[PDB]
Design a protein around this nucleic acid. Structure first.
Lengths: 106, 90, 185, 134, 70
RNA sequence: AUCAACUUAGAACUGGUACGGACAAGGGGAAUCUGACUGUCUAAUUAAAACAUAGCAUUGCGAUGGCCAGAAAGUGGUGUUGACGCAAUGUGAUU
RNA sequence: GGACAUGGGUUAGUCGAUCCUAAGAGAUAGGGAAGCUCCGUAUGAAAGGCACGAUUUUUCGUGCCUAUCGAAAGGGAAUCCGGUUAAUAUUCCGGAACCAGAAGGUGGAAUCAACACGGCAACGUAAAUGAAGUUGGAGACGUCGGCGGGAGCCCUGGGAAGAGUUCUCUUUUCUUUUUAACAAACCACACCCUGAAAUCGGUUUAUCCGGAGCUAGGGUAUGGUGUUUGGAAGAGUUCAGCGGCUGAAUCCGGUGCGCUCUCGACGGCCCUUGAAAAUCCAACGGAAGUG
């Protein structure tokens, strides 16, 4: 059997996303569903972050704090490899500026 | 050998003329070829748009500015060498 | 690992185990096996090899567990200086949480017959509680302290490590870090 | 041999990423529970806050309080540095059993805290106690 | 929309002031379903033994409004 | 061992030699004139050999500028532009 | 009769508008124009905030840095099932949920080592303070081409209920055999660890990958239109009886270059590279702090 849109929006668009259900009354019916969420992406490398669900922007507000982040420095904003590069590059350049200062001070 | 002479241009068929398609052939094999990445050495550099050359090597991910069809042009290479020798002299 | 003596064999009943395993116990009425992990206590039915119940201890670290002979009550002794009484028909959350111990709790033991149980910790003090259970639903189990056994030395930050109950009467076997076994009658 | 007891290193992976730690004991040969070349370290989780000559004594103590942590870390996750910290009073306190029984772990954390407090007051290892910005 | 596997906590939610009514369901496969209408959720409890179901029913406080199969 | 899917080859036998059995469903070739091609237009008599096009070439202009607009303005476009660009044209693929 | 006459009829926190911005319209500042009005849209504008302090000569000091309109097909908070009416329904009724905001209360956790622990790690946990300032992410994006997964329909093997045909034949022909939002548990391409690889190996329909650490062994993450229950059989459907009521049945499986929508991993194309903003989250930093 055939179905119709539940809303007054024809013209399947990105917001007119639908699903077929069979009801307890043995009816084939559309179900208007929302778009899919996105996993937050890394700030430096652009890879999606690991440990966070894939939700719409406002649906992120219902989660608990630990469910949206990762327990690490920059966790939930940068990937683990990106953070590791941040740490080692930070330390190495700091040792350089120390060794350059010791060179130029004498 | 499916095509003895036309090569990648076989998609264009019989249209556009022989010479006007041969120069495209040389440019198009350059444009779609894979180039060795100067930073990681992996043969993973491919053109993205005109002038943009992106490396898909896991851990490199470097983008490059280059020629429209080839990563390095003769004019850019000449400019790099002359500027290098000028800086060394200065 | 589960070892069958009659067949003289050993096996691992878990296809995949989540979390580090701290302690194990056998149910006294129904053929269940209790796994005390870092934070959770999971009940597994051996005959059909499935997960029966999960207990959320709400505690960073679980040290030891004991089971009432009725099979519907569990005590969780934790490294968080806490005792958690779980009643299997009460809730998934601990029915009672007790924080009398001043140091990390090592072991908890239930008397097999009498409604008495004890918690031994590294502070050197043994807490003796009376845990009364009725099968009637209206009557929640009565958990009350009874005695605070003291005057046990602590060696290398280790106090009362193990406590055991007499099978018949209310006698306590407490082992210390100094090699002393105390008889609390 | 550059991972020796008393050597300051940086944790690059885990919850304590980017924290400065001191090599407490190296087991590079491996172990049954840790088949890799691990090394147990003691470090700082909450670095003491910056202090000012204008600050009163109560806040000077209040900011100078430091929260330590003890952790066994893989060699690949540690970044050794040239700095060295003199681990007085901190030679024998860590053992496989000290991790097995957290009561010894809790005692180790307290002793590590009081040593770090005193060393910070003494004004030694300024680089060790300042947070690393990245 | 809330399945309860613990008898006591089903009783406690029944004693809780949010509870308004309880319902009894007797299925053909001979299991008893105790459903408890609350303010926000409907807590249902499935029991496979008749006498445990009966002792549970009398364990409900008298003030609660209990209804048979609908 | 049992279980599940339609795609090809070959054998006979058979029928008013019938056989994509209705439906559906290219006429083909040898040449001239012409526009290279796909595309566009006179809605309501002209669909073309016209227009467009890629390609070719020419011209103006380095910004206090070329080209265009406005009654004027402390105004607007090309222009989030810079000669591998914008503007103005003529021819019209290739050989 | 869509005619004619008299009446009746459209119920929403969840569907739209409203909110957001697009191309673009457009006041103000200013400058033109005899003028009607024109140009203009952060411009040649004094274009508005925020925090400290015994209260400061009881006449206020000290620091800190953009209108509006414009989309019922774009972006976007949250609702499903069964039923009901002569005509309304995701709107009413019965049942079952959800989102946003507000306030205190119960319970639990952290806390005098003020701001939790575990795992080597990727990360996990029922909680786990964070001002100003900065920054990141989601919203947020073309097109075509196969390949893999899911749901609904289609096809199909038995069971059971009726009904069709029956001169003959057909353990058969047909109809029915249903399970919503939502809550809960469970469910492996990227990544981590061990390890060191040339007799080079892994692997795809499609040749990409590896000493920048392959294969392999063990992990972590993502978790629905999947599964098991709750919803929930009491509903819907079919059938057999009674005078509104009472009985049954709604069951067990297979399949695929199948269609429709979606989803995942990829591939190709471009002198073509394929919106914004509102909104929401997170991070670096460390103001501040019996209760």
């Amino acid at each position: 059997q055939r179905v119709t849109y539940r809303r007054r929006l024809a013209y399947n668009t990105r917001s007119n996303r639908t699903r077929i259900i069979k009801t307890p009354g043995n009816n084939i019916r559309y179900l208007h569903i929302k778009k899919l969420g996105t996993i937050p992406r890394c700030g430096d490398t652009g890879v999606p972050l690991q440990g966070i669900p894939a939700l719409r922007p406002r649906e992120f507000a219902r989660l608990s704090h630990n469910k949206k982040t990762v327990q690490r420095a920059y966790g939930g904003c940068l990937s683990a490899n990106a953070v590791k590069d941040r740490i080692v590059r930070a330390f190495l350049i700091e040792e350089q500026k120390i060794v350059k200062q010791k060179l130029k001070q004498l | 050998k499916r095509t003895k002479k036309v090569g990648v241009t076989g998609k264009y068929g019989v249209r556009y003329g022989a010479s006007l398609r041969r120069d495209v052939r040389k440019i198009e094999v350059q444009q779609h070829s894979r180039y060795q990445c100067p930073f990681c050495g992996r043969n993973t550099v491919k053109r993205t748009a005109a002038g943009i050359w992106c490396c898909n090597g896991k851990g490199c991910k470097k983008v490059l500015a280059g020629g429209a069809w080839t990563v390095t042009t003769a004019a850019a290479t000449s400019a790099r060498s002359t500027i290098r020798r000028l800086r060394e002299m200065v | 690992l589960i070892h069958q003596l009659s067949r003289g064999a050993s096996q691992s009943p878990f296809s995949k185990s989540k979390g580090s395993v701290q302690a194990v116990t056998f149910h006294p009425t129904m053929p269940y096996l209790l796994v005390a992990t870092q934070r959770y206590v999971r009940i597994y039915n051996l005959v059909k090899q499935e997960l029966v119940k999960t207990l959320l201890t709400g505690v960073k670290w679980v040290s030891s567990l004991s089971v009432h002979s009725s099979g519907d009550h569990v005590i969780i002794g934790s490294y968080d200086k806490r005792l958690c009484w779980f009643d299997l028909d009460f809730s998934s959350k601990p029915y009672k949480n007790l924080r009398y111990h001043s140091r990390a709790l090592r072991d908890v033991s239930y008397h097999p017959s009498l409604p008495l149980f004890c918690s031994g910790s590294d502070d050197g003090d043994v807490q003796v509680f009376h845990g009364r259970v009725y099968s009637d639903l209206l009557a929640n189990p009565l958990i009350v302290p009874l005695k605070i056994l003291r005057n046990h030395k602590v060696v290398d930050n280790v106090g009362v490590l193990s406590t055991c109950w007499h099978p018949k009467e209310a006698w306590l076997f407490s082992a210390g870090a100094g090699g002393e076994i105390r008889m609390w009658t | 041999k550059i991972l020796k007891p008393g050597k300051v290193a940086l944790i690059t992976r885990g919850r304590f990423a980017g924290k400065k730690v001191v090599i407490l004991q190296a087991i590079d040969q491996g172990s049954k529970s840790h088949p890799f070349g691990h090394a147990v370290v003691a470090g700082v989780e909450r670095y003491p806050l910056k202090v000012t000559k204008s600050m009163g004594a109560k806040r000077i103590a209040r900011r100078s309080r430091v929260k330590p942590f003890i952790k066994v870390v893989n060699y690949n996750h540690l970044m050794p540095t040239r700095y060295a910290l003199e681990l007085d009073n901190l030679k024998g306190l860590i053992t496989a059993d000290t991790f097995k029984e957290p009561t010894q772990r809790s005692a180790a954390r307290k002793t590590v805290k009081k040593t770090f407090e005193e060393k910070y007051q003494s004004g030694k290892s300024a680089w060790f106690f300042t947070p690393l910005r990245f | 929309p809330r399945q309860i596997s613990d008898i006591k906590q089903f009783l406690e939610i029944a004693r809780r002031k949010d509870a308004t009514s309880a319902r009894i369901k007797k299925n053909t496969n001979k299991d008893v379903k105790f459903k408890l209408r609350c303010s926000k959720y409907l807590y249902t409890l499935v029991v496979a033994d008749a006498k445990k179901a009966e002792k549970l029913r009398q364990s409900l406080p008298p003030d609660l409004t209990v209804t048979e199969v609908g």
